[PDB]
Design a protein around this nucleic acid. Structure first.
Ligand SMILES: [Mg+2]
Lengths: 122, 166, 443, 232, 86, 58, 76, 43
RNA sequence: CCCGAU
DNA sequence: TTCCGAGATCAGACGAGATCGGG
DNA sequence: TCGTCTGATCTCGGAA
C-alpha cells in the first residue's frame, strides 16, 4: 500500500463533492449485505463527508464555474493554494477576503480586493 | 483535500470473477482505505480513479487474482493555510473542541491566541465575549503500534474580526 | 580500528554536516573509490557528492590521485580527520608562542582549510579591528610581519602542487583581484612543538627546574634542522648551550656542565626514541593508577623492570599477599595490560609446562589504550549529542520558570564538563600516538 | 539423522498409509484398490462449491462410520474442525453453507499416489485413481508392478494422499499411470504384461487353438465390465 | 547456585575512580574555543543544507522563508618560506 | 550413494523456454538439449523420433 | 511468438491445477456441467471445451516474457 | 564470507518451502477477467 | 542398539 | 656463493542406499 | 574401515 506520490492538490470542494454525489448514488445500485460482515467504515465517511461539503452551498455550484472563476483568478497573481481557498472558502462578504483571506499583506491594495468581491459574488 | 497517488496489491477472491476488475477492485479498495489516516499522508476517504491497473496474476497458493493497482484516492489533509468551518462538539477547560460536520471529531484546538477574554471555565462557556471558523495550524500524527488520536491537529483563531458572529 | 571510524563519523557530524560525514565516512570505509562509484554505493545523488568532496578537499581530508585507468580515485587519510579534535589546542600554543594576531592566523587557517596570504590577512583585519577601538584601528602591516614570523619557524607550510587532472575542476574549490598560492597549517610542526612541551614538562616535574630549560633551549635551537621522522635530535655542543640560554638564568657554565652530564646520564635518557618510550609507560602507569589503585600499579611497574621473570617473584618482590596479588595479575591480563605467557615451551599442555611468565609488551598495551581512548571520546560527544536537542526551548527564551532555568545551568555545567574532558583525554592520544609513530618504520 | 538430510528434505508426511500389497487384475491399469478402513481415515478436504453441496450433504449424514462420509467440518472461518461423531450430523448437514471445508473420506475417483520405498527411478511414485474396495491390502493391476519393482511376496508400499486441489492435478496429469507408461531411460514401455498374462495370450494366439461360438463368446464377454459395459 | 540469583549487578562500582577534571586552570582558554568554533563551523559556508526538506514540502507558499570598515592598504609579497616539494 | 551424489548435483537443471538448458544460476550447460531438443522418453528406437519404415507402413 | 505452440504437460497440469482450485472456491463455471462434483473433473471439461479464463505467462530466462492464452494453444 | 545466496534451484526452495521453479513452477499464470487501464476523471 | 520385513 | 623456486614426500580429513516392524 | 583429496615441509638445481 506504499504511497508513491504524497501530494497533488487541485481538488476543489465542488470536484470532491461531485465525485462523492456520483459515488454515493452509484454504490447503492450495487450496495451489498455480503460485505457488511466485512467492511462498513466506507459508508460512514462518504455519507457524513457529503454533508460538510454540502454546508458550502455547492448545491447549485456548477462545473463550468471552476474554469470561469479560474480564468479571473490567473490575472490576480494569487497562488494555487490561495485560489483553492478562494473557491473552497467561497468568501461570502468582503470582510473574509478583506481580513480572513490569506496573503492580505501588501497584495490587498483596496483595488483588486474590491474587484475580487465582484468575482467571488459571480 | 489533496489527491494521493497510491499503489496497492489488491486480491480479488475467486468468487467475484463475474464482475469487472476495475469495479471489483474499487469495492475492495474502499474497504481497505476508508476512515483511515495514513501516517504523514492524511485521512483517506474514498477512491477517485484507478489510473493504471496491471495484469491479474494468480499465485501458486490462493487461486485468487492479485492485481497490482496504481490509483489516486482523495484524502483529507489541511495545507497549513486553510480557514475551515466546523462545529463545537465539546468544550474542555484547557481548550475548545471543534468538529468538522460529521467528518472527524478529532480536531482539538488549543486556545491561547484570541482576544484577551479567553477562558473555558467547565460550565461550557465557549469564549468570554468581546458554524465556527477554524485555522488548522500544524500536522501531527502518531503511529499507534508500539508493543506485542493519530491525526489530531492544533487549531487557531486569530483576529479575524468575525463580522457576522462577534 | 572501528572505534577510530566511530569518531570520524562523530567529528564531521558536529563540524560541517551529515552528508559530508556520510560520503566522508564511507570513503574511509571503502578507500580508493571513484566519483560515480561513491554516489552509487552510499545512495547519494551526484550533485551532492561533488559538493561534499569539494568541502572535503578544501579541509584536506580527501586526497585524489589517478594511476592507470584515467579515472581519479579519491582517498581519505584517516589520521588527519582525528586532528580536528585537537583544533582548539592548536589555537592555544600559538597564543603562548605568538600574539593574539598570529593566534587568529592559525585559527582561520584551520577553519577554512586552504588559504592564500591575500585572503587570511584581509580576514583578520576585520576580526581584530571589530574587537578593538574604532578610530584606534589595528594596522594590517603588523599582521604581515607576524605572518612570515610564523613561517620562519615553519609553523605554516604550503600545499603540494595541484595535479590539475581533467576530472578535477579548478573553479569549484575556491569560495566566492589576485590569485596567489594556497596553504594549510603545518600541524606536523605542532606535533614537534607539542612534544617539546611534553619533554620539558617531563623533566621539570621530575628532575629540577633548571634541568628542563636547557632541554627546551636545546630543542628550540633544533627545530628546522630536524623533522618528525628524526630518530633523535641533531647533536649539539655544550658551548652553544651557554650561548642559547635565556636571559632569566645566571648559572655558571661549569655547574650547568655538571647538570649537563647529570641530565645526559639517567634511566630516562636528546634521545627522542627513548623520550617518547619513557613517557608512554608513565601514561600506561597513570591509567592503572587511575583504575586499579596503587597496589596493582606497584606490580605493573614490576614487569617493566624484569622482562620475563614472573609469578615466582611477584608474590615476593611486592610483599602483598598471594590472594590479593593474583587478582591483580588476572585483571591486568583480562584487560590486556599484562600481555601473556610467551615462554611456555612444554609441548601442548596447559597443566604440564615450563611455567608461564607474565611480560608486559609496551606496544600492545599502547595500541589498545589508544583504541580505548578513541572509544572514550565517542562516549563523550554522544552524551553532548544527547543533551542538546531537548533543551532548545529555553535557549531562545533568553534570546521561564525556576525548574526551566535550573535545567539550563545543569546543562551548561554538563556540557562544559564534557567539552573540557574531550581535551584532557586528547593529550593522552598525542602522547601515545607520537610513541606509535616513533616505532613505525616505512611510514 | 540431522535436520538437513532427514528433516528438511526427507520429512515425514501426514495423510499417508502403508499396507501389504496383493494383486488384482480386475482393475484398470490406472486404479489402486484401497481398503475401507484406510479410506475412512485418509481424508481429502473438499471445499463446498455449488456442485458438491448436495453430494457433501448426502455424505455428511453418514458421518465417520459408513464409508461414503466425512469426519471433520471446518466452518468458513478457521473454526476448529468439528469432529463429526458426537454432534447431530443432520444439524451440521443443513447448516453447511458455501465455502466451508468438509474432510470427506477417500472416495473412489480420488487421486492417491503410490511409492515403493526403495525408489530407484522416476516410476516408483505414480499416481493412481482410488476405488474403495473391501479388504486391507493395496491391490493394483499387475501390469504396473515392474515400474514399482514390486512382487507380491509380502512387499509393502506407501500411499500418500495429496490435499490441495493443485496437488491433485499435478498427480493426475504428470504422474498418472496413463501418462508414465514409458521409462525415460530408453523410451521403452515399462507397464506391460507380466507372467501369466504373457503366457495366457501366447497360448491363446498360438496357431493351434480354435474356439467355437460357445467358448468364443465366453472369452470375449469377459471384456465388458468397468467403462466397457456399454459397447456393442 | 552461588551466583544463580540475578544479573550479577546493575553496575560494578570501582573503589578507585577518576582523579578530577585534570589540568583545571588553563583549559578555560581551549574550552571556550571548543564552543566558539562550533558556533562558527555550523554557521559557516562550508556546510550542507537539508534540501530533502524542501522536496518533502508540497506546501510551498509566499511570505515564508521556504519561498524567500576593513581599513587596509594594498601590498603584494609572495614568500617561499615553505617547502618546495610534492 | 551414487544415486545420491548424482541427483544432488543434477537436480536444478531444466530446459528453459528458449530451448536452452541452464543451471539454477542462469549459466548455460547446453544450447539445445542433447543437440535436437528431443525427449528420450518419447524417442523411438535407434535414438530417432520416427523410425520411418514403421510409420509409412502404418 | 517464439516458444512452442504446444501446451506442455507442465502447463496443462498447472492450468488444471489452479482452475480446479478456482472452481473449488465457487468460481463461475464455463461449461454448463452435467453433475460432476469433483472440481478436477470439471476443469478437464473446461479444457476440452477450451473455455478457461487463464493466460500463461511464459518466462524466457533472460527476463522477457511472452503471453499465451489457453484458447491459443494445442492441447493433446 | 558474507554469502548472500538467492533462493533458487530445488534443494533450497524445498527447504524454504517455496514452489520450485523447475518444472511446473517455471512459468506463471494470469487471469483473463474483464479489465482495462481506464481513463481517469477530470480534476 | 539388536532383531526382523522388503 | 647464493638462493629462489619447484617436484617430492606424510598427515589429516569426513564420506559410504532406502524404508517399515517389534522388544 | 581404508579410501580419498589437501597442503605442509624438505632438497637437489638453475639463474645473476
Ligand atoms: Mg519382494
Amino acid at each position: 500500500m506504499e504511497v508513491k506520490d504524497a501530494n497533488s492538490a487541485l481538488l476543489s470542494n465542488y470536484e470532491v463533492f461531485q465525485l462523492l454525489t456520483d459515488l454515493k448514488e452509484q454504490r447503492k445500485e450495487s450496495g451489498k449485505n455480503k460485505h457488511s460482515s466485512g467492511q462498513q467504515n466506507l459508508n460512514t465517511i462518504t455519507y457524513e463527508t457529503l454533508k460538510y461539503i454540502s454546508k458550502t452551498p455547492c448545491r447549485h455550484q456548477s462545473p463550468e464555474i471552476v474554469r470561469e472563476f479560474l480564468t479571473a483568478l490567473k490575472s490576480h497573481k494569487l497562488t494555487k493554494a490561495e485560489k483553492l481557498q478562494l473557491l473552497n472558502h467561497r468568501p461570502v462578504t468582503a470582510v473574509e477576503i478583506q481580513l480572513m483571506v490569506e496573503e492580505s499583506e501588501e497584495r490587498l491594495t483596496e483595488e483588486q480586493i474590491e474587484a475580487l468581491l465582484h468575482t467571488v459574488t459571480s | 483535500f489533496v489527491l494521493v497517488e497510491m499503489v496497492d496489491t489488491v486480491r480479488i477472491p475467486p468468487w467475484q470473477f463475474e464482475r469487472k476488475l476495475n469495479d471489483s477492485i474499487a469495492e475492495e479498495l474502499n474497504k481497505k482505505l476508508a476512515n483511515k489516516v495514513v501516517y504523514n499522508v492524511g485521512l483517506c476517504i474514498c477512491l477517485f480513479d484507478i489510473t493504471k491497473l496491471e495484469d491479474a496474476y494468480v499465485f501458486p497458493g490462493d487461486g485468487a487474482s492479485h492485481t497490482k493497482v496504481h490509483f489516486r484516492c482523495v484524502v483529507f489533509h489541511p495545507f497549513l493555510d486553510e480557514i475551515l468551518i466546523g462545529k463545537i462538539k465539546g468544550c474542555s477547560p484547557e481548550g475548545v473542541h471543534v468538529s468538522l460536520g460529521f467528518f472527524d471529531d478529532i480536531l482539538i484546538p488549543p486556545e491561547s491566541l484570541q482576544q484577551p477574554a479567553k477562558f473555558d471555565e467547565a460550565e461550557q462557556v465557549w469564549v468570554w465575549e468581546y458554524g465556527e471558523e477554524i485555522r488548522f495550524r500544524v500536522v501531527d500524527e502518531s503511529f499507534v503500534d508500539t508493543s506485542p488520536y493519530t491525526l489530531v491537529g492544533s487549531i487557531s483563531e486569530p483576529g479575524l474580526g468575525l463580522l457576522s458572529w462577534w | 580500528t572501528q572505534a577510530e571510524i566511530k569518531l570520524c563519523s562523530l567529528l564531521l557530524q558536529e563540524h560541517f554536516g551529515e552528508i559530508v560525514e556520510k560520503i566522508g565516512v564511507h570513503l574511509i570505509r571503502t578507500g580508493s573509490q571513484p566519483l560515480r562509484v561513491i554516489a552509487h554505493d552510499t545512495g547519494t545523488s551526484l550533485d551532492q557528492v561533488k559538493k561534499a568532496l569539494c568541502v572535503l578537499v578544501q579541509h584536506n581530508l580527501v586526497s585524489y590521485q589517478v594511476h592507470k585507468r584515467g579515472v581519479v580515485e579519491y582517498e581519505a587519510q584517516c589520521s588527519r580527520v582525528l586532528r580536528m579534535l585537537r583544533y582548539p589546542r592548536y589555537i592555544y600554543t600559538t597564543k603562548t608562542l605568538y600574539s593574539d594576531t598570529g593566534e587568529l592566523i592559525v585559527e582561520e587557517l584551520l577553519l577554512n582549510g586552504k588559504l592564500t596570504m591575500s585572503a587570511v590577512v584581509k580576514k583578520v583585519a576585520d576580526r581584530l579591528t571589530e574587537t578593538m577601538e574604532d578610530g584606534k584601528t589595528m594596522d594590517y602591516a603588523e599582521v604581515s610581519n607576524t605572518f612570515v614570523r610564523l613561517a620562519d619557524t615553519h609553523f605554516v607550510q604550503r600545499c603540494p602542487s595541484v595535479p590539475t587532472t581533467e576530472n578535477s575542476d579548478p573553479g569549484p574549490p575556491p569560495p566566492a583581484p589576485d590569485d596567489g598560492i594556497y596553504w594549510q597549517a603545518n600541524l606536523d610542526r605542532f606535533h614537534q612543538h607539542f612534544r617539546d612541551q611534553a619533554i620539558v614538562s617531563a623533566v621539570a616535574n621530575r628532575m629540577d627546574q633548571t634541568s628542563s630549560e636547557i632541554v627546551r633551549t636545546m630543542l628550540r635551537m633544533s627545530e628546522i634542522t630536524t623533522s618528525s621522522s628524526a630518530p633523535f635530535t641533531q647533536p649539539l655542543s655544550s658551548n652553544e648551550i651557554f650561548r642559547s640560554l635565556p636571559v632569566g638564568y645566571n648559572i655558571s657554565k661549569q655547574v650547568l656542565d655538571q647538570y649537563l652530564t647529570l641530565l645526559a646520564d639517567d634511566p630516562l635518557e636528546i634521545n627522542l626514541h627513548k623520550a617518547l618510550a619513557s613517557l608512554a609507560t608513565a601514561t600506561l602507569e597513570s591509567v592503572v593508577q587511575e583504575r586499579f589503585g596503587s597496589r596493582c600499579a606497584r606490580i605493573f611497574r614490576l614487569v617493566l623492570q624484569k622482562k620475563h621473570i614472573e609469578q615466582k617473584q611477584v608474590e615476593d618482590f611486592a610483599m602483598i599477599p598471594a590472594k590479593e596479588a593474583k587478582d591483580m595479575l588476572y585483571k591486568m591480563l583480562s584487560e590486556n595490560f599484562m600481555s601473556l605467557q610467551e615462554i611456555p615451551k612444554t609441548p601442548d599442555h596447559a597443566p604440564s609446562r615450563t611455567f608461564y611468565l607474565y611480560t608486559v609488551n609496551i606496544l600492545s598495551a599502547a595500541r589498545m589504550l589508544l583504541h580505548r581512548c578513541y572509544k572514550s571520546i565517542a562516549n563523550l560527544i554522544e552524551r553532548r549529542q544527547f543533551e542538546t536537542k531537548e533543551n532548545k526551548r529555553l535557549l531562545e527564551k533568553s534570546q521561564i520558570t525556576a525548574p526551566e532555568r535550573q535545567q539550563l545551568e545543569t546543562l551548561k555545567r554538563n556540557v562544559n564538563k564534557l567539552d573540557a574532558s574531550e581535551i584532557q583525554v586528547d593529550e593522552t592520544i598525542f602522547l601515545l600516538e607520537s610513541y606509535i609513530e616513533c616505532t613505525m618504520k616505512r611510514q | 539423522q540431522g535436520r538437513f538430510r532427514g528433516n528438511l528434505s526427507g520429512k515425514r508426511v501426514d495423510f499417508s498409509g502403508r499396507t501389504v500389497i496383493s494383486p488384482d487384475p480386475n482393475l484398470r491399469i490406472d486404479e489402486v484398490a484401497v481398503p475401507v478402513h484406510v479410506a475412512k481415515i485418509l481424508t481429502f478436504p473438499e471445499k463446498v462449491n455449488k456442485a458438491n453441496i448436495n453430494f457433501l450433504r448426502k455424505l455428511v449424514q453418514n458421518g465417520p462410520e459408513v464409508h461414503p462420509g466425512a469426519n471433520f467440518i471446518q466452518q468458513r472461518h478457521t473454526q476448529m474442525k468439528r469432529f463429526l461423531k458426537y454432534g447431530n450430523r443432520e444439524k451440521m448437514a443443513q447448516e453447511l453453507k458455501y465455502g466451508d471445508i468438509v474432510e470427506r473420506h477417500l472416495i473412489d475417483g480420488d487421486v492417491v499416489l503410490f511409492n515403493r520405498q526403495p525408489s530407484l527411478h522416476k516410476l516408483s511414485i505414480m499416481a493412481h485413481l482410488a476405488r474403495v474396495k473391501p479388504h486391507r491390502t493395496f491391490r493394483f493391476n499387475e501390469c504396473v508392478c515392474t515400474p514399482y519393482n514390486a512382487d507380491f511376496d509380502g512387499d509393502e508400499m506407501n500411499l500418500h494422499l495429496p490435499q490441495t486441489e493443485e496437488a491433485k492435478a499435478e498427480a493426475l496429469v504428470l504422474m498418472g499411470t496413463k501418462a508414465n507408461l514409458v521409462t525415460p531411460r530408453n523410451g521403452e514401455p515399462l507397464i506391460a504384461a507380466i507372467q501369466d498374462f504373457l503366457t495366457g495370450a501366447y497360448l491363446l494366439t498360438l496357431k493351434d487353438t480354435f474356439f467355437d461360438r460357445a467358448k468364443a463368446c465366453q472369452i470375449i464377454a469377459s471384456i465388458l465390465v468397468g467403462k466397457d459395459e456399454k459397447i456393442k | 547456585f552461588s551466583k544463580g540469583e540475578k544479573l550479577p549487578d546493575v553496575v560494578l562500582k570501582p573503589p578507585p575512580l577518576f582523579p578530577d577534571t585534570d589540568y583545571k586552570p588553563v583549559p578555560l582558554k581551549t574550552g571556550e574555543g571548543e564552543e566558539y568554533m562550533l558556533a562558527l563551523k555550523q554557521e559557516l559556508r562550508e556546510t550542507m543544507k537539508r534540501m530533502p526538506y524542501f522536496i518533502e514540502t508540497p506546501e510551498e507558499r509566499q511570505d515564508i522563508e521556504r519561498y524567500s570598515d576593513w581599513r587596509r592598504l594594498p601590498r603584494e609579497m609572495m614568500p617561499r618560506n615553505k617547502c618546495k616539494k610534492a | 550413494y551414487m544415486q545420491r551424489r548424482l541427483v544432488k548435483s543434477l537436480e536444478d537443471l531444466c530446459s528453459q523456454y528458449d530451448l536452452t538448458v541452464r543451471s539454477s544460476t542462469g549459466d548455460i550447460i547446453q544450447f539445445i538439449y542433447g543437440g535436437d531438443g528431443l525427449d528420450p522418453a518419447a524417442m523411438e528406437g535407434k535414438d530417432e523420433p520416427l523410425e520411418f519404415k514403421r510409420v509409412l507402413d502404418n | 511468438r517464439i516458444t512452442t505452440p504446444y501446451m506442455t504437460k507442465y502447463e496443462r497440469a498447472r492450468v488444471l491445477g489452479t482452475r480446479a482450485l478456482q472452481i473449488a472456491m465457487c468460481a463461475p463455471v464455463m461449461v454448463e456441467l452435467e453433475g460432476e462434483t469433483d472440481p478436477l473433473l470439471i476443469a478437464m471439461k473446461e479444457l476440452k471445451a477450451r473455455k478457461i479464463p487463464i493466460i500463461i505467462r511464459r518466462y524466457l530466462p533472460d527476463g522477457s516474457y511472452e503471453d499465451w492464452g489457453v484458447d491459443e494453444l494445442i492441447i493433446t | 564470507f558474507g554469502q548472500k545466496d538467492s533462493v533458487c534451484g530445488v534443494s533450497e526452495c524445498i527447504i524454504m518451502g517455496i514452489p520450485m521453479n523447475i518444472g511446473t513452477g517455471l512459468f506463471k499464470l494470469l487471469h483473463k477477467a474483464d479489465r482495462d487501464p481506464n481513463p481517469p476523471k477530470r480534476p
